[PDB]
Write a protein that binds this ligand. Structure first.
Ligand code: NI
Ligand code: NI
Lengths: 111, 111
């Protein structure tokens, strides 16, 4: 359950050019992450509400679980695409440490 | 990212009869959880390995993400079914506190 994005930002320094050329992509990702997180929080609330009314694996509960999964999946994908687009801006020599952090975090289940 | 099952076990005391009549279900769920967790760890490793070879949203990476999602989803469902089967063994008077803990944890995204 680690925060893959935060892990990478904290663990892998960028050089001056790298920081500058990725600023716009970081801003766009922050906005996209917030939008999807709003959907995920709402979906979690709908699952909670469904179960509050009848705790059972019912059609309502099943559909609410799918909405949670879709929002979490959209966030996971958007996060990976952003990780990959950052990698493209890195100098080639700087990719091995970025990759190490990425791969290790994925292996532990971070998203 | 809270552990829904652990939250419920720690926060909601059971009476003597409740504890006794749920022991077999707890054992079965522990075994099922471990089996699915083994699959999830393996799937996380395969996603890490795929990205190690080419960090890109490629067919291999996409398929590995789906395997992670399927294992996580199987675990989420098995966990909820077990939560519901425990609820059935509770005395009716004991369900409101169980439900409170369940609903609050779901609202925060625990699974
Ligand atoms: Ni970033
Ligand atoms: Ni249990």
């Amino acid at each position: 359950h680690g925060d893959l994005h935060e892990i990478l930002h904290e663990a892998v320094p960028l050089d001056a050019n790298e920081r500058e050329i990725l600023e716009l992509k970081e801003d766009a990702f922050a906005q996209r992450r917030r939008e999807i997180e709003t959907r995920l929080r709402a979906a979690n609330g709908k699952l909670a509400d469904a179960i509050a009314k009848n705790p059972a694996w019912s059609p309502e509960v099943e559909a609410a679980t799918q909405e949670v999964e879709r929002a979490a999946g959209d966030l996971q994908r958007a996060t990976l695409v952003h990780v990959f687009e950052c990698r493209a801006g890195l100098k080639p020599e700087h990719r091995p440490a970025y990759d190490r952090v990425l791969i290790d975090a994925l292996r532990r289940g971070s998203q």
